[PDB]
Amino acid sequence: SKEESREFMAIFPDIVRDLTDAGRHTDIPEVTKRFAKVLQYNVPTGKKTRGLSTVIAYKMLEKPENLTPENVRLAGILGWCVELLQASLLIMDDLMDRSETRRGQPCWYRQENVGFLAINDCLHVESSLYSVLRKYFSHLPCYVPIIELFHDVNFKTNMGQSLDALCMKDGRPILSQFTMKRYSSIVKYKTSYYTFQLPVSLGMYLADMYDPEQHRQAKTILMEIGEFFQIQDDFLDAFGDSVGTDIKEGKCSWLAVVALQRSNPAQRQIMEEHYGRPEPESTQIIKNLYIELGLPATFAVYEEESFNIIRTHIHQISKGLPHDLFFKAMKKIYKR
Amino acid sequence: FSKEESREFMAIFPDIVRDLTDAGRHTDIPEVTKRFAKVLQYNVPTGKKTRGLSTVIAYKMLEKPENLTPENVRLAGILGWCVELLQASLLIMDDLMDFLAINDCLHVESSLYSVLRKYFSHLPCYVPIIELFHDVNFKTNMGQSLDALCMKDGRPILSQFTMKRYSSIVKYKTSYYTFQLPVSLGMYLADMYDPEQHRQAKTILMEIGEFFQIQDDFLDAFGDVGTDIKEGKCSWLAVVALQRSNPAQRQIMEEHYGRPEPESTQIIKNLYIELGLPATFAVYEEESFNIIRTHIHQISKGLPHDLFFKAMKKIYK
Ligand SMILES: CC(C)=CCC/C(C)=C/COP(=O)(O)OP(=O)(O)O
Ligand SMILES: [Mg+2]
Ligand SMILES: [Mg+2]
Ligand SMILES: [Mg+2]
Ligand SMILES: [Mg+2]
């Protein structure tokens, strides 16, 4: 919605001022001005789906009579703390992957006189969201649960990143590690917690929903939606309309995992030889093998089956949680 | 630090590793939790844990003797290990920038908040403590960035080497997390929340922090291994050299400061000797010692002298 996008974007400039121009650290204006540019470059140029989903989650969890402009704005500020967390992770991930571009612009680490100083900027941006939480939430009962959620999700996302790294040795993929079990774990910890659980749990906390059973039931369905989301993303890297590099980078992708499940030994040897090679021909050989194993058809079947299984699980969701919130998320991801 | 203090502090470390690597929770990701255990084990508990043990000593000298139970001294130890987890994250980041993965520094920093939640979430000091770590982390990152703004394209920006910028770099990059953080944690655990008590403690500890780094900078060049000159660091020696230099002496700093050639390091050292930086350091060491001793003697707001005298005498030896 137009109103939601505009209300959300209007908050960002206030957060930059809160972090760089609140009359604090006035002895060091050169580093506060630089930090403004770090935030301005890395935080607000994406689709901001996670931050906006934090607002939508709150709007569907809170009692209608409690939805004031002021409370909706607080949900906006929590949304931007999610976008600050993501900004920090992607600054670091782009350095780790040595990627060229993110959101159509040169990766932050490639900018002049940054490189490995991107590590410090990563830590700085992540640290900044706790300053935003203190300013706007320190007087509310959801303060400590929200701080704890952000620290725990950061920890879990790091476990996800590190598990991803244990699928590679010396810039070569370990194909024996590419099991559906490990893939599912990587998706859960590396992406699902910060993408799906974090926005909804923030919505619940701001709506003073602290029942751990409610958070556990929410998590169960959001982890399942998370798995389809990443599997679809993995499928599109290879078979989407154009610039995917999963094959070249030797990533533990759903396609690589399913390919290795369905491969005869000669097909296996093509993966061993060619998966994660920098030569464009090697990328084409893996793509050709994926076509040969019928992965497009496999994905189409998984897309229909997973949709039906998740919708079934949403209907079984115990009273207290709005089914509409989870159906709305499914509708966003499946476009259906 | 006493033998009993060192041993009871060290006995906590294996508990923290098990808390962070989910031992007995039966995790779905044992391969990466076992790796993280090794990250903590290899990088956190080795050498002198001076910040960690200082947190315990600060607590013991701030708390009412009646409240110094084994249980409370152990909580001071865990707070100390949270400071050592922060120290370990900062060392890992320095190592990456010069087995460790790039995200290990973020992960180790993140882990201290898991430890604070586990052991302190029930205490009135919980929120002040986590807010202190948040603010110190932010300020440390600012210090690191300000240090980086003294270098461009691998060449030092000598116009940036002012005493004001130096003092700021030390305060933000080092002093907040090394000197203030241990004492503030001790105060919070002892239920000392008075902002004026934290402010008076902060004033003295920032002054001790400045001497610590100036002495460290002095010894890098004149100690009995040092690379500050080669790396083109914003050192107290470089700053004072530029204050004292005539134009011909400035031109030697421009030409030779931050060069990889060993000869360039010797030229800068010869200039430091010429400009009388040894004697200038000796004068500053005496004047700073007397000013800090005076501030400790004048310490009010019901703060104990002996904690600050002990910190001062440890750094000045
Ligand atoms: C601890 C850290 C730094 C976590 C990284 C989290 C993250 C979302 C990385 C992107 O993974 P990717 O490289 O598979 O995806 P993308 O295509 O977005 O780069
Ligand atoms: Mg990447
Ligand atoms: Mg990556
Ligand atoms: Mg992708
Ligand atoms: Mg040194």
Residue numbers in the entry:
A (entry chain A): 87 to 328, 334 to 427
B (entry chain B): 86 to 183, 202 to 327, 334 to 426
Please quote the paper that reports this structure.
Isoprenyl diphosphate synthase in P. cochleariae (PcIDS1, EC 2.5.1.1) produces FPP in the presence of Mg2+, but preferably forms GPP when exposed to the heavy metal ions (HMIs) Co2+ or Mn2+. Inter- and intramolecular cooperative effects in the homodimer strongly depend on the provided metal ions and regulate the biosynthetic flux of terpene precursors to either biological defence or physiological development.
This orientation is stabilized by L344, whereas the corresponding I420 in PcIDS1 tailors the allosteric binding channel to GPP.
